[PDB]
Subunit: 184 residues, 4 copies
């Protein structure tokens, strides 16, 4: 349970840093999470993330803090919502978006054969926009229901005051880290 | 020169953290800078900033790294451009924007008596939007030329893929930190 | 009553076309409305407007339909809200926005002792954006409260899916049209 | 040639009004154009359109002016670009966008073996946004290349200051109008 979660993620984070993925880190920082399995995964508190995320350091990246349950808020909701459809995928990571990265992700998905969906906040029902915290889950579902298969990659373009993101899911941190490795 | 710059900023950053300004930290992180005086201030390399900025940690903030020249890129250009109008103001800091913070900043500026200007990227000439790195300086000038006096505070609302910011300037880090202290 | 209104608006409209203000017409078309008096003016049905508005023809403008009560809706609701603060200002017109046009208006505002204000859908709380047709009222109220004087001109920039607009008011069509001319 | 074009578009327009498609008209108004043939169709001047377009009247629509060559500009440039890829598709119409309308189009697209594509001004390089009237060509090219088939319908969501739009094409006005009807 918990220890295994804390160890596997803590390792992935260390390896993530070692491969030095600077071009992939957004401005808000990258968080890498690993949730508890259902039905115990009821809140972001049940999901382990990097406290302070991982930010661009010099010509490298740095995890500001240690792995702790309740560390991540936005990515946890995403993975948590995603589990409502694929309960085995309790790991995820958010990386920077840009034409190059997405084009290159598309190509690789094409090759290694795996789905990528998305969601556009411009197509979001005002009412949902109104309710706080309802947007991230809305996006995940929209994206998930968009295609027929399971999307390993879900992204969205920017919106007023909000930057674009690329989310990549895995059943555990090692698998997530593996997709990232490919991206290079 | 340099040592004095490195010391004064390094102290302010330590004090900034101590006052624990979590509500004021944006998602992209807060950077606090102190530039070299003209004519030596020719690039962001001549400006000292926090490497990795200062991010929300727990119910607090944390400066990811040490103070170094060339640490800041976006705020340095802002302060650098600002100096073209008020060469004595080589310090600045960017904090989170929101109705509350701005309303409260307005009120205080009213009280302690000091100017606040702004710029809107929606009123930005396409051509400028086109040239990379020309936007931050454009904003600063627009904001500076907007009012007749010197604006200690310059902010801007969000835009597609970009969040809103509140910039506050001072002639040195101590003065900047003092405006922030008031904000509480 | 109604006849005096109908006659006046109908004449101002005919003269607006006559002066040929093509560059001041927006893509959505310009509308010119004149409301009944308080408390009669209880809805957009109590306001007279151009059916099908006035639109760009060739290198000229053209009124699409005749003046009728209820013809307008948006511009009508705007003047309705505006009358809560200045009951005698029952006439208004909406014209194309542009840096060039708006600056002209400023100059003239200064050169003629007229006041101009604005509002921003970005500073609009999400809650209000959720209630259909609650935005126009919000805008007008916002712009009027932004200054102590009565704003003859109220504008706003573009928003996702919505174009910028400049609304000019007056006691009657003559006053309103009278201003258009200075601008021209 | 020109007369056959004039006559056909003029009749389709008269019938469009006749079917009363109010809910399918945008605030900027709907235009219906029919171009000459390649290589004759060398500019928007070689394309026939509704002067002053067709706009919303009451609970009905109305053509503001007669059919003339060069009447259109945007819709005309769109079909011009579209003809570089499908030379025989010289007719097009632009209609109001909305989740409800677009979904209907999808269903019908599926239920009638028609293809639909789109473009996004957000994925538009800043360089292209800088060159006046280079966006429409960009959009059409983008949407057409997004899929291997010919897209009968090309749409796009709203952008700052610009509304969303759904463009439907056809070999001639009958084909185009023919589709509008299914939608209705």
């Amino acid at each position: 349970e918990k220890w295994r979660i804390y160890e596997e993620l803590t390792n992935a984070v260390r390896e993530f840093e070692s491969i030095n993925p600077v071009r992939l880190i957004p401005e808000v920082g990258t968080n890498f999470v690993y949730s508890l399995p259902l039905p115990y995964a009821r809140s972001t508190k049940d999901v382990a993330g990097v406290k302070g995320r991982i930010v661009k350091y010099g010509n490298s990246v740095k995890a500001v803090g240690p792995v702790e349950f309740g560390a991540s808020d936005h990515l946890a909701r995403a993975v948590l919502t995603y589990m409502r459809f694929y309960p085995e995928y309790r790991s995820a990571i958010n990386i920077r978006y840009s034409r190059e990265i997405i084009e290159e992700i598309i190509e690789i998905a094409q090759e290694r054969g795996f789905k990528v969906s998305f969601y556009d906040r411009r197509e979001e029902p005002e009412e949902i926009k109104a309710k706080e915290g309802a947007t991230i889950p809305w996006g995940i579902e929209t994206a998930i229901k968009r295609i027929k298969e399971r999307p390993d990659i879900i992204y969205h373009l920017g919106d007023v005051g909000k930057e674009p993101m690329i989310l990549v899911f895995g059943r555990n941190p090692r698998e997530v880290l593996e997709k990232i490795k490919m991206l290079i």
